[PDB]
Amino acid sequence: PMSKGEELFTGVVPILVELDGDVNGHKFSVSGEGEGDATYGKLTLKFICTTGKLPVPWPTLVTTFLQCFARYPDHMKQHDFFKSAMPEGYVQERTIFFKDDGNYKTRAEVKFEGDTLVNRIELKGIDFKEDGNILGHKLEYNYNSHNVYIMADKQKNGIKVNFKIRHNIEDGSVQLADHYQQNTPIGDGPVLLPDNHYLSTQSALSKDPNEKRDHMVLLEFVTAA
């Protein structure tokens, strides 16, 4: 292959997602489970809020809830930092600025625990407007397609990422979430540091009609470029 860790993703890999969140004081925890298939770049997940009802819309948390499952084509596996960081994993820090509303601050650890790919997150949301689009729940239960731009970080043998999410507001228009992401490896061994390249995402949000807990099922498709 191109990296040792890439061989960890040659099969469908089960996923565990854990988030502790806090938004304008509202505390919540989410658990998610599912599997990823990096050779297609497909991910299917079902998250449940385990503390009651999510204080913010589920689409706002999609990008916080696994980029080691991106399908890197053959002529591009030399650019796949995420798998090269494995098994030991990487920290994934992000500051999301929602246009004209508050911010999320998120810290995650993405690593193999056993045979499962685990993304363990802490999220802090501050300065949200009581009736803005987030705390007003004015977003639509859907998700656009995005292009997330990836650059190597030579000083930290990691990657600096920047992209912008489009949250379809119920009134038709778009509420921007501007993501500032930093990925830093947990282990000593070398990593693949990529030439500037894009990741293409597609995401489907739906529900599990025999689960009556606040939940989100996510069908995500990620590919390199």
Side-chain angles (χ1 to χ4, degrees):
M2 273 317 195
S3 177
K4 166 184 81 172
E6 171 196 345
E7 302 254 88
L8 308 185
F9 291 84
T10 60
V12 188
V13 185
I15 302 168
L16 168 71
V17 184
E18 195 97 16
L19 173 145
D20 295 301
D22 167 11
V23 178
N24 283 29
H26 194 142
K27 290 174 190 143
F28 56 104
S29 288
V30 182
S31 291
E33 325 187 331
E35 48 270 347
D37 173 12
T39 36
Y40 277 28
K42 264 176 224 239
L43 301 105
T44 73
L45 301 141
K46 177 207 176 194
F47 312 91
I48 307 147
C49 182
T50 69
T51 54
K53 183 192 160 55
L54 211 67
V56 297
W58 283 110
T60 67
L61 296 175
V62 179
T63 56
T64 302
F65 294 152
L66 290 152
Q67 284 180 332
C68 40
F69 287 106
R71 187 196 132 263
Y72 273 79
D74 282 310
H75 59 94
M76 275 189 62
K77 321 172 292 153
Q78 60 254 300
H79 298 340
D80 190 345
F81 156 84
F82 304 106
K83 309 191 169 56
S84 52
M86 294 306 174
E88 46 279 320
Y90 51 71
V91 175
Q92 169 156 316
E93 265 194 299
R94 259 222 204 102
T95 284
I96 302 152
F97 306 85
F98 292 88
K99 205 49 182 166
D100 293 319
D101 210 341
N103 302 319
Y104 290 165
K105 265 125 188 211
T106 73
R107 206 170 50 202
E109 209 170 281
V110 183
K111 80 201 188 243
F112 278 95
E113 297 173 8
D115 73 332
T116 317
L117 199 286
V118 176
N119 167 26
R120 270 179 211 280
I121 315 116
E122 263 206 290
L123 182 152
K124 177 61 190 150
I126 51 138
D127 309 303
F128 279 95
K129 280 147 50 219
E130 290 68 33
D131 50 30
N133 294 319
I134 288 90
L135 300 189
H137 292 258
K138 306 209 248 230
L139 303 205
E140 215 139 55
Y141 198 77
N142 51 59
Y143 217 79
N144 294 284
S145 166
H146 304 73
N147 316 275
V148 356
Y149 186 51
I150 308 200
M151 290 178 66
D153 171 337
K154 280 141 200 319
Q155 302 169 228
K156 310 221 226 16
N157 62 220
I159 58 162
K160 333 215 212 72
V161 193
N162 277 167
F163 60 109
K164 273 144 32 151
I165 299 295
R166 299 127 57 206
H167 291 303
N168 284 167
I169 315 179
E170 179 87 0
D171 79 355
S173 67
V174 152
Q175 155 81 87
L176 293 162
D178 198 325
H179 285 48
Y180 282 73
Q181 169 191 337
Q182 178 67 39
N183 294 62
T184 286
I186 281 196
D188 304 32
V191 312
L192 281 161
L193 284 174
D195 273 331
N196 294 19
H197 63 297
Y198 288 96
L199 283 186
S200 191
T201 64
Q202 309 223 309
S203 324
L205 311 176
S206 92
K207 299 276 189 189
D208 182 61
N210 35 62
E211 166 88 77
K212 35 199 291 176
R213 287 171 294 189
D214 192 11
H215 67 275
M216 165 180 79
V217 174
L218 156 71
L219 295 336
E220 177 151 326
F221 172 71
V222 200
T223 45

